[PDB]
Design a protein around this nucleic acid. Structure first.
Length: 68
DNA sequence: ACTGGAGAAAGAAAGTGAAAGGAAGATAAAACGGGATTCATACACCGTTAAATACCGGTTTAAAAATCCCGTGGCGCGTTTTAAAAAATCTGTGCGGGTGATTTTAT
């Protein structure tokens, strides 16, 4: 789901987080593809304050964010 | 000749799809054990009598009970271990409005 940029210098790159695919589609068409990236999420995210470490690890959105 | 960037080769480390097999499950056929009938047949209850046994009086005697000395092991005390049961603390889950997403078929 990641739409990456073309710059290879991390000090000149940006990342945007959006709520879902409907917002991501609109964001990808108006961005500057040279040094901007878009990563869509899915709904409300897990509350890590009330959860456990294994429960956090078993999540999918958190894993995708960590990988990104 | 020399320098530094860039592309291509070559080599080594990590991820991968496929692998007997075995303990761990699961599912049927079989052997079992516990009720409803059906009587014939052996068992329960009632008069009669010869016989076997219980009981009394007095011995006795051999065996068991009572008594004394002693020397030990089997209970008793104090202090540790160790499972077992109980109290305390975590883990899921569903109720109803909200946010955002997935898949298979025909022509």
């Amino acid at each position: 789901k990641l739409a990456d940029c073309q710059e290879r210098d991390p000090a000149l790159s940006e990342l945007y987080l959006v709520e879902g695919d409907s917002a991501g589609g609109s964001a990808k068409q108006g961005r500057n593809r040279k040094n901007q990236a878009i990563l869509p999420l899915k709904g409300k995210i897990l509350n890590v304050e009330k959860a456990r470490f294994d429960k956090m690890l078993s999540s999918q959105e958190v894993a995708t964010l960590i990988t990104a």
